[PDB]
């Protein structure tokens, strides 16, 4: 299948280089597997999610995205015209609040959610959970993350914003789950992104396109929009059955594009999120 005038992110996760706006896939596009976007919540009545969206878990008064990030997020995994794994299901889990904030207990709270939850729901091609968020080292936070990735959950959380070495920042410094970094469509490492060892994969980060609250769309940049390209990538893989929720950040690095990148430090993988879909 191939989506003309795509957001460049797309276009680069299906593509050998930069410069180009089509996205290409394999029109199962992730049917039967199951994304959480653990964040601010999904806007599912979004026309964009076409039933495909709901929220299963709140932590504040509402379970509405009253922020929009977390709906941004949900889009670049599984929008009809944003997202990577254009058939899979979302389920929010809205552990951030309104102003994008949440303690560390209610985030680890979140994670222990979808380890148990997924069990209530229909999956048979895997299961994943996209963390967009991320504060100070914690192990009690990274405990959480290697808990819900132990439990057959293929974990992609962002590395963070910082232009820093991840290894001080949590859920990114947990080594168990897919630390993702930002790049930018020159295929630079975006300005803010950190690096680090830990760093498993980049993703597009820099202007990404999708959709928002109010029914709406806009483009904006972070970790947090790298995150979910790489986390609908393993949901499409899973429904392809090239890999499992256990071995797919091991195998996006093994397939993603090498050397491509610029301005990653020494010691930092050169590797940017690629589908290897060959028509
Ligand atoms: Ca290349
Ligand atoms: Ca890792």
């Known amino acids: 299948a191939a989506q003309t005038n795509a957001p460049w992110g797309l276009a680069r996760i299906s593509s050998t280089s930069p410069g180009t706006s089509t996205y290409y896939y394999d029109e199962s596009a992730g049917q039967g597997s199951c994304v959480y976007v653990i964040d601010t919540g999904i806007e599912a009545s979004h026309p964009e999610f076409e039933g495909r969206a709901q929220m299963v878990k709140t932590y504040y008064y509402s379970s509405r995205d009253g922020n929009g990030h977390g709906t941004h997020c949900a889009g670049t995994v599984g929008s009809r015209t944003y997202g990577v794994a254009k058939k899979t299901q979302l389920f929010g889990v809205k552990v951030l609040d309104d102003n994008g904030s949440g303690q560390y207990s209610t985030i680890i709270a979140g994670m222990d959610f979808v380890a148990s939850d997924k069990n209530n729901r229909n999956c048979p091609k895997g299961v994943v959970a996209s963390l967009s968020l991320g ?10 993350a290697a808990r819900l990735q132990s439990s ?3 974990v992609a959380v962002a590395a963070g914003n910082n232009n820093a070495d991840a290894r001080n920042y949590s859920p990114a410094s947990e080594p168990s789950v897919c630390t993702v970094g930002a790049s930018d469509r020159y295929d630079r490492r975006s300005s803010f ?11 597009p980060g820099t202007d990404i396109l999708s959709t928002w609250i109010g029914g709406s769309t806009r483009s904006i940049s972070g970790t947090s929009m790298a995150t979910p390209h790489v986390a609908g990538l393993a949901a499409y893989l899973m429904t392809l059955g090239k890999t499992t929720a256990a071995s797919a950040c091991r195998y996006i690095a093994d397939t993603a594009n ?3 990148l ?4 020494f010691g930092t993988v050169n590797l940017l999120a690629y589908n290897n879909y060959q028509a």
């Open 258 to 260: 090498k050397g491509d």
């Open 193 to 203: 992104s950190n690096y680090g060892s830990v760093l498993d994969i980049f993703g």
């Open 135 to 144: 504060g100070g080292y914690s192990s009690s936070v990274n405990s959480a």
């Open 152 to 154: 057959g959950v293929m």
């Open 262 to 265: 610029s301005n990653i430090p």
